[PDB]
């Protein structure tokens with residue numbers, strides 16, 4: 001049996017490896033460039049507000065009030081970078097958020113003491 | 125142990141990112157990521173954090189990075205205007221220190237389907 005609790009952990013030490021290398025810096029820069037576009041971030045808001053369910057371009061055009069060609073231009077940039085997966089079988093193509101790169105970028109930005117939850121697993 | 129967990133309930137999945145992403149501050153967030161989409165800037169952030177986040181002078185960072193003082197000074201100015209850094213005096217010498225606030229905010233905007241927490245297992249007898 002396990003009793004689960006979620007509690008507050010004490011703050012971490014500020015910035016709990018060394019400085020990023022030339023290539024690792026070039027890579028994350030490239031990713032931040034992709035999210036550096038207000039349209040792209042707005043796209044992301046709407047994927048997020050739908051619970052990260054898959055969506056079609058016509059659904060995103062309805063959610064955003066921008067044209068299909070606009071939303072497509074930006075979905076390709078986002079898929080190419082790796083923030084979204086394209087599920088192309090069928091009559092209507094879906095796009096799905098991928099969590100992986102968002103987590104890597106969170107790590108890059110772990111500057112300062114963090115306030116985290118702690119999940120205690122009480123096995124008994 | 126630190127653990128990135130998947131947030132498989134759609135209501136929980138993006139529960140901390142949805143609001144700031146949806147807000148009229150979203151264009152600001154995107155300007156911040158644009159500021160961050162420069163490699164030299166990211167490395168400056170790296171050198172600062174690799175020093176425990178103490179305030180550092182431009183002279184010290186030009187020595188650490190091998191880049192010229194006009195280069196680093198340009199980057200520092202853009203990062204300070206963005207709010208990532210601010211300036212703190214040491215007598216008449218100007219130091220730069222990272223500000224944790226915006227970064228914590230950016231972490232929340234990027235909490236898309238997963239999050240970091242600490243896992244602790246306990247046994248009982």
Ligand SMILES: [As]
Pocket residue numbers: 047048049050051052053134136137138139236237
């Ligand atoms: As989500």
Ligand SMILES: [As]
Pocket residue numbers: 014015111112172173174175176177
């Ligand atoms: As630090």
